[PDB]
Design a protein around this ligand. Structure first.
Ligand SMILES: CCCCCCC/C=C/CCCCCCCC(=O)OC[C@@H](O)CO
Ligand SMILES: CCCCCCC/C=C/CCCCCCCC(=O)OC[C@@H](O)CO
Ligand SMILES: CCCCCCC/C=C/CCCCCCCC(=O)OC[C@@H](O)CO
Ligand SMILES: CCCCCCC/C=C/CCCCCCCC(=O)OC[C@@H](O)CO
Ligand SMILES: CCCCCCC/C=C/CCCCCCCC(=O)OC[C@@H](O)CO
Ligand SMILES: CCCCCCC/C=C/CCCCCCCC(=O)OC[C@@H](O)CO
Ligand SMILES: CCCCCCC/C=C/CCCCCCCC(=O)OC[C@H](O)CO
Ligand SMILES: CCCCCCC/C=C/CCCCCCCC(=O)OC[C@H](O)CO
Ligand SMILES: CCCCCCC/C=C/CCCCCCCC(=O)OC[C@H](O)CO
Ligand SMILES: CCCCCCC/C=C\CCCCCCCC(=O)OC[C@@H](O)CO
Ligand SMILES: CCCCCCCCOCCOCCOCCOCCO
Ligand code: NA
Ligand code: NA
Length: 457
């Protein structure tokens, strides 16, 4: 169930001989996830800089161990990567001493779990570096050091947790991303199934920076904070099988509305090299919405439409929405077993001063195949402000809303007619056509494409 150490993994695979594959089998005490990935990426900077391209292959080995003693359990997953260049073998990885190596080791998850606070097996308390995820992937979908309480039953779901990054636990990164340094997260949610397959809930997330900004006159570099914040997100979300590839309803939907409030102290800088010149404080009062509708046309075919908007601009930036920093924006919103980046495998938009229209169609055959075709159109909301994170590394021209368009294709075979697959092979690709906001001299297209072979043993 929810408690299982691989429950949140997008792969959805089940090792042969595991208790999930056959309930007569004992829970596995160990296993191995093998991933072989090729990545083609050109051009992340749209041709406005040297390099920024990938055509490379890697292997990622993830051994894991699991022990259970009554109400106590413990879990470790490690990671060993070897690649021909620094490709993305891990969809949950984000961002001098932050250059990844072509090969590295990592401690991916390490936690202890206690399920005895209540008699519900859906209720448990987990402590350590662990997978945090909610179904939208837009609040949390990451491996992070946390103390997280989960309560998942038929009629009531609730979670409450605290998290903070202290290390990457990687042989090649020595330092945290500035955004993560000294940032503490506190969060909770409560939701109820008010009708079969219809959920309504509220969600809260609070991020608190205890860091300091560089002082005036000090040089600022890659690894320094751009800002410190006290930010609270308060959201309501309604879903009808929003992310359930096995829905029997003719229509699935999601609707979320999120208010961001709090305050930011922003570092100001000038060039001389970058030098700090001061800081400016201000309140944040921003808003995000994500809406979608999926038609379940028959047993195999689905289609849908999406609309998202993160506010931008406003009186000294108060209306600039942003996400928690723990999000993936990866979800099953196209109604298949395969998770898809909600704002493009190529653009990888953060919902920050961003408006997106989305169309998709998908096809699924039992547990054996799925395919998604996704079209996105992106606009800035305030054309004098930047957007948030994105997989495109090029500057936006002031006064231009048209960010661009994207076409994504995901195609997956699961295997090892198959009841519960234990392996998959997947093509994951996005084609991004930059709009006028990227100005002249840009590449007319860029792409990011992956082939992933995943095996769970
Ligand atoms: C299904 C029909 C359509 C086909 C889809 C395939 C999509 C390709 C996506 C990923 C391609 C990865 C290319 C790997 C190059 C590896 C290499 O040996 O070069 C290393 C050298 O560059 C040193 O750095
Ligand atoms: C704060 C973060 C804490 C990090 C803890 C990391 C723990 C590492 C996982 C190792 C799993 C525990 C070791 C297994 C014990 C020997 C055994 O086999 O016990 C029987 C078992 O097979 C029953 O299921
Ligand atoms: C059933 C067939 C499935 C198809 C996949 C089988 C292929 C398995 C091998 C994958 C290994 C790729 C990573 C090699 C690391 C090389 C390296 O460390 O790079 C050094 C230097 O050359 C880079 O600059
Ligand atoms: C079946 C074959 C599988 C083979 C792969 C086994 C999986 C890997 C085990 C995981 C080992 C992770 C240890 C992380 C240490 C981080 C660190 O020391 O960082 C130092 C650096 O930051 C400088 O300060
Ligand atoms: C905003 C985020 C805050 C969320 C964290 C909440 C922690 C506080 C606990 C408070 C306990 C109240 C429990 C109500 C009774 C439960 C019940 O009805 O029984 C389960 C049954 O319905 C299933 O079979
Ligand atoms: C990038 C591609 C984006 C495409 C996005 C499209 C979004 C909307 C999907 C709308 C699907 C509704 C189809 C109507 C069902 C056909 C029907 O009813 O035939 C009669 C049958 O019901 C009697 O048996
Ligand atoms: C390491 C080489 C690279 C190091 C980068 C620099 C700093 C290293 C500090 C390492 C401190 C690690 C503490 C483990 C805590 C896990 C846990 O128990 O969870 C905490 C709780 O859940 C939080 O809320
Ligand atoms: C520029 C703004 C453009 C806005 C257009 C957005 C287009 C995207 C489709 C979103 C369709 C909304 C679906 C969620 C509402 C579900 C619902 O109300 O049902 C009640 C429930 O099912 C009772 O059971
Ligand atoms: C038939 C055989 C199957 C072949 C597969 C073909 C897949 C085609 C996907 C292409 C989907 C692109 C949709 C463009 C949206 C229209 C639009 O809005 O552009 C105007 C602009 O947004 C502002 O007005
Ligand atoms: C290199 C990237 C590799 C990505 C692999 C994706 C799979 C290739 C496209 C397969 C999708 C084609 C759809 C027709 C086959 C489904 C069907 O109607 O027949 C089912 C029958 O075969 C049951 O077994
Ligand atoms: C390296 C520069 C030249 C790039 C050509 C190789 C690219 C290989 O990957 C294919 C491109 O990515 C595909 C994006 O998905 C396309 C979606 O539209 C398909 C319509 O059915
Ligand atoms: Na419990
Ligand atoms: Na569906």
């Amino acid at each position: 169930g929810s408690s299982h150490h691989h429950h949140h993994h997008s792969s959805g695979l089940v090792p042969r001989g595991s208790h999930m594959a056959n309930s007569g089998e004992a829970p596995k005490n160990f296993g191995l996830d093998v991933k072989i990935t090729g990545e083609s990426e050109n051009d992340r900077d749209l041709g406005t800089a040297p390099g920024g391209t990938l055509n490379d292959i890697g292997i990622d080995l993830r051994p894991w161990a699991f022990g259970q003693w009554g109400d106590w359990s413990a879990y470790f997953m490690g990671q060993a990567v070897a690649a021909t260049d620094t490709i993305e073998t891990d969809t949950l990885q984000s961002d001098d001493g932050r250059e990844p190596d072509k090969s590295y080791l990592a401690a991916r998850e390490f936690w202890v779990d206690y399920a005895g606070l209540t008699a519900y097996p859906g209720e448990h308390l987990r402590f350590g570096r662990q997978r945090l995820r909610e179904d939208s992937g837009q609040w949390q979908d990451t491996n992070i050091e946390a103390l997280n309480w989960s309560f998942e039953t038929t009629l009531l779901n609730a979670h409450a947790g605290v998290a903070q990054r202290f290390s990457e636990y990687r042989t090649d990164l020595d330092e945290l991303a500035p955004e993560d340094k000294d940032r503490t997260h506190v969060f909770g949610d409560i939701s109820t199934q008010w009708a079969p397959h219809h959920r309504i809930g509220v969600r809260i997330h609070h991020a608190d920076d205890s860091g300091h900004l560089r002082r005036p006159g000090e040089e600022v570099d890659n690894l320094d904070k751009t800002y410190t914040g006290q930010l609270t997100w308060l959201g309501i979300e309604a879903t009808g099988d929003a992310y359930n590839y096995r829905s029997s309803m003719p229509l699935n939907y999601w609707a979320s509305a999120t208010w961001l409030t709090g305050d930011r102290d922003n570092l100001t800088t000038t060039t001389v090299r970058r030098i700090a010149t001061g800081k400016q404080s201000g309140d944040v009062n921003a808003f995000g919405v994500d809406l979608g509708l999926r038609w379940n046309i028959d047993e195999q075919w689905k289609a849908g439409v999406g609309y998202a908007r993160g506010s931008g601009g406003g009186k000294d930036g108060e209306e600039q929405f942003q996400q928690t920093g723990l999000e993936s924006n990866r979800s099953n919103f196209t109604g298949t077993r395969s998770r898809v980046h909600r704002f493009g495998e190529a653009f990888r938009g953060e919902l920050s001063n961003l408006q997106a229209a989305t169309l998709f169609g998908s096809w699924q055959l039992r547990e054996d195949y799925d395919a998604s075709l996704v079209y996105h159109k992106f606009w800035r909301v305030d054309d004098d402000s930047d957007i948030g994170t994105s997989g495109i590394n090029a500057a936006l021209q002031p006064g231009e809303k048209d960010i661009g368009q994207e076409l994504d294709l995901v195609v997956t075979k699961y295997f090892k007619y198959v009841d519960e697959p234990s392996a998959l092979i997947r093509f994951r690709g996005g084609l991004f056509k930059p709009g006028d906001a990227y100005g002249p001299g840009t590449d007319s297209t860029m792409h990011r494409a992956f082939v992933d072979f995943i095996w769970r043993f």
